[PDB]
Amino acid sequence: MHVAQPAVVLAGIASFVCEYASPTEVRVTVLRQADSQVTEVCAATYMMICTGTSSGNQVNLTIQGLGLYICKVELMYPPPYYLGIGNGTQIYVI
């Protein structure tokens, strides 16, 4: 499953939409990729720092208190498990 997110966003708050093509339990993770390392910013499970609202097959993710922020979406159940990892969103705080 492909996950689309904006390549660039400008902000202390930054919001971006994360969209996936689901074929009922979804798990959303925001990962920050620094150097060649990955940190967890945000995580939540929904069953159709961070603020997440689900409108259909998309999640509106707002980060606050502000790099490459990777949107990760998982279809957990019913099987099959699906993993989607976005190309990442560059956020510019200035």
Epitope: L31, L83, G84, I85
Partner: antibody, heavy 118, light 109 residues
Framework: QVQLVESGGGVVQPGRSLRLSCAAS????????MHWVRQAPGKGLEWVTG????????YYADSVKGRFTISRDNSKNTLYLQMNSLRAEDTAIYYC???????????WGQGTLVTVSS | EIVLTQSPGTLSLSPGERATLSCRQS???????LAWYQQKPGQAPRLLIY???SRATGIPDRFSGSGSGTDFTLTISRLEPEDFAVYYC?????????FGQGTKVEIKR
């Protein structure tokens, strides 16, 4: 330093049962999908079963569905494989593997050998 | 169920030469959750590449991956003696997690 150490392998008679354990350390066990992957002698890698972060979701290869059961204890930081109805073709090295947050199997145990023979 | 097919079955090369390994998957996923593993005899598999082209931690520069869609390639730019082993590709985008059947990189003589 991530470590995964499998134990419990040995010789088992057909039709019987065996429990494997994978003791994890060096990472927050609860935050990763865990798997069992096996390799029969002279053959390739075959994914057997995996289990979600919290233990609530279990996924199985058709080859073992209904015979093998995966579980995890996120306090002991241990992964389990309960093998029932064992068959000669289940003879394999059984590896414990961690799923990186970006998806691949980024750490593997050294494996434990299960030999199914009468 | 995504099936991975590797080619060739065996590559026969000498140290210092370039190794090109192919992996084809039965359907595209919209992205590349495609990993490569190395396995030396009597040793567990070791992750080399994920996301088609990203190097795993501690993996040397000579290993690189490329491709997209259904068509992926692992390249070892200049083989070292420790690189003669079996290499597996894998898709990790959906269950069941599936592997290619492996490619042996052997010493040519």
């Amino acid at each position: 330093q991530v470590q995964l150490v499998e134990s419990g392998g040995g010789v088992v008679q057909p039709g019987r049962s065996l429990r494997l354990s994978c003791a994890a350390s060096g990472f927050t066990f609860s935050k990763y999908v865990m798997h069992w992957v096996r390799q029969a002698p002279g053959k390739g890698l075959e994914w057997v079963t995996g289990i979600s972060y919290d233990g609530r979701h279990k996924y199985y290869a058709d080859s073992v569905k209904g015979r093998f059961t995966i579980s995890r204890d996120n306090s002991k930081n241990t992964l389990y494989l309960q093998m029932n109805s064992l068959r000669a073709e289940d003879t394999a090295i059984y590896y414990c593997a961690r799923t990186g947050w970006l998806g691949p199997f980024d750490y593997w145990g050294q494996g434990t050998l299960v030999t199914v023979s009468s | 169920e995504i099936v991975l097919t590797q080619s060739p079955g065996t590559l026969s090369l000498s140290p210092g030469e370039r190794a090109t390994l192919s992996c084809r998957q039965s359907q595209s996923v919209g992205w590349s959750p495609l990993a490569w593993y190395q396995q030396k005899p009597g040793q567990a598999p070791r992750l080399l590449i994920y996301g088609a082209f990203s190097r795993a931690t501690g993996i040397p520069d000579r290993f690189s991956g490329s491709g997209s869609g259904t068509d992926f390639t692992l390249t070892i730019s200049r083989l070292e003696p420790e690189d003669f082993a079996v290499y597996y590709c894998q898709q990790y985008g959906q269950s069941p997690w599936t592997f290619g059947q492996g490619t042996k990189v052997e010493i040519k003589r």
